[PDB]
């Protein structure tokens with residue numbers, strides 16, 4: 001079966017782990033344990049295709065930024081996550097995309113921009129602002145809540161659909 005190597009990236013605290021764990025394990029992680037780098041692997045059927053998803057849940061803590069090159073080299077598609085209640089995290093996306101672009105020497109890397117924590121009302125990043133950023137990268141923008149599971153499958157399975165278009 002086809003394996004998809006997905007990598008979840010973005011600033012600390014944006015919900016990368018909660019998103020991944022919601023997808024793979026169907027519960028919401030309420031606590032905040034910063035990640036170094038974790039791997040998850042699950043067989044799923046996406047659009048009739050039995051798929052192995054290999055998901056790398058990466059560090060948002062800037063102290064671990066030296067690890068980015070390695071994971072950007074091996075990843076096939078990237079979920080670029082910010083939180084809609086964290087303007088800085090949205091502004092941080094570009095450093096992630098620019099590095100992905102550099103490492104893969106490509107302006108056409110499979111990516112999805114994810115505005116997470118869409119269950120929270122303290123929104124400082126409007127959907128349209130994020131749509132505009134995604135448009136500039138040629139990628140979809142999807143809002144998610146790891147808490148309620150809104151958009152979670154859509155974000156990941158879409159990443160897959162973007163990889164398939166490559």
Ligand SMILES: Nc1nc2c(ncn2[C@@H]2O[C@H](COP(=O)(O)OP(=O)(O)NP(=O)(O)O)[C@@H](O)[C@H]2O)c(=O)[nH]1
Nearest residue numbers: 012013014015016017018030034035060117145146
């Ligand atoms: N309300 C709400 N809280 C969320 C959501 N996603 C994550 N959180 C909360 O935000 C905090 C950080 O989530 P976490 O997944 O650990 O973030 P991370 O991006 O993996 N952090 P790190 O980069 O340090 O590994 C946790 O308390 C978690 O419950 C969401 O969609 N909604």
Ligand SMILES: [Ca+2]
Nearest residue numbers: 027028029030
């Ligand atoms: Ca919980």
Ligand SMILES: [Ca+2]
Nearest residue numbers: 107108137138
């Ligand atoms: Ca692009």
Ligand SMILES: [Ca+2]
Nearest residue numbers: 124125126129
């Ligand atoms: Ca504003």
Ligand SMILES: [Ca+2]
Nearest residue numbers: 138139162165
């Ligand atoms: Ca397309």
Ligand SMILES: [Mg+2]
Nearest residue numbers: 016017034035
């Ligand atoms: Mg994490």
